[PDB]
Amino acid sequence: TCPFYKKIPGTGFTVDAFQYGVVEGCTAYFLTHFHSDHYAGLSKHFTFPVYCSEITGNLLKNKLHVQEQYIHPLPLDTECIVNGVKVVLLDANHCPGAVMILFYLPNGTVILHTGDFRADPSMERSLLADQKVHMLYLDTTYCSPEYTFPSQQEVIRFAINTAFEAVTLNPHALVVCGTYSIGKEKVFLAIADVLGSKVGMSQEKYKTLQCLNIPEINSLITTDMCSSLVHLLPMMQINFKGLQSHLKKCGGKYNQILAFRPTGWTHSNKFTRIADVIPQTKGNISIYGIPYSEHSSYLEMKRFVQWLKPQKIIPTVNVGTWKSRSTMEKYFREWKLEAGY
Ligand code: NI
């Protein structure tokens, strides 16, 4: 059944609750972002109102064929009324079009639902600064102190310099970047930019990127593989067998592949710095795992919460085991006691 952490008390609202059939008593279904665990269940046959960002709205229309009459896009950073309740959408610093939702309950309670987010100090100067938040529905994906990772900027720096050096040494080397969802576009766009190439990709993936309101996007991507030296492939094909196979398809235009796998976290983060990352190599193929996260590190999460000082925290990730739940509740208490709220 719909779990309690997907329901907004004192409203008829749900968040990211599309795979439970009709939820008894829901008058408006909110979608934080276009990732499949979140939209799971949406289709052209959905006939309830969906509230979301403009970008998520382009993807529902174009990729899932939801009918226009049911898609209700809202502008960001703007006080809006939905079924008699004031709401604001804020940027979540996750994937394109991803939002957090502020709900102002008629009784005076204020609720923030983070969706999926990477907490940042910049959020301390949004509309969130202007009033108190009583309950926080928190993205707890990496809520454990082992989860450190570098900034997005430091990771992109590493990737740009790696690719540029490799291709300047060998002008017959191909760069390939894996993907399975929206998010992490900066990786492949930053590499294509330093190399003076467009990124080439399948027709489905080009369609997906064309929904995303990226500036000058017509100049940066293409479906013509032959004219591109940065290819995107399904993440599943980013392995030695998959890459050899792909290289055969390029018709002796290339004799080397340098490939990037933007993971979330991996245990080499516990020891290794970004400067000291190395590839797995077999022959003329090298594969780099880079820790490009669109979720909060443990420290970024802790800082955001200690700044927000909520009265109650409701986790939305890792809730399925008692050991996880218990561990998270302990960090929350530590954070509250250290900060004094
Ligand atoms: Ni997500």
Curated annotation (Swiss-Prot):
Residues of the full protein shown: 700 to 1040 of 1040
Stated family: Belongs to the DNA repair metallo-beta-lactamase (DRMBL) family.
Organs and tissues of expression: Expressed in brain, heart, kidney, liver, pancreas, placenta and skeletal muscle.
Ranges annotated as spanning the membrane: none
UniProt name for this protein: DNA cross-link repair 1A protein
Upregulating conditions: During mitosis. The mRNA encoding this protein contains an internal ribosome entry site (IRES) in its 5'-UTR. This 5'-UTR generally suppresses translation while specifically promoting expression during mitosis, when cap-dependent translation may be impaired.
Function: May be required for DNA interstrand cross-link repair. Also required for checkpoint mediated cell cycle arrest in early prophase in response to mitotic spindle poisons. Possesses beta-lactamase activity, catalyzing the hydrolysis of penicillin G and nitrocefin. Exhibits no activity towards other beta-lactam antibiotic classes including cephalosporins (cefotaxime) and carbapenems (imipenem).
Record text on subunit structure and interactions: Binds constitutively to TP53BP1. Binds CDC27, which is itself a component of the anaphase promoting complex (APC). Binds PIAS1.
Subcellular location: Nucleus
Sections of the chain in a coiled coil: none
Effect of H295A: Impaired nuclear focus formation, reduced interaction with PIAS and increased sensitivity to cisplatin
Domain of life: Eukaryota
Gene: DCLRE1A
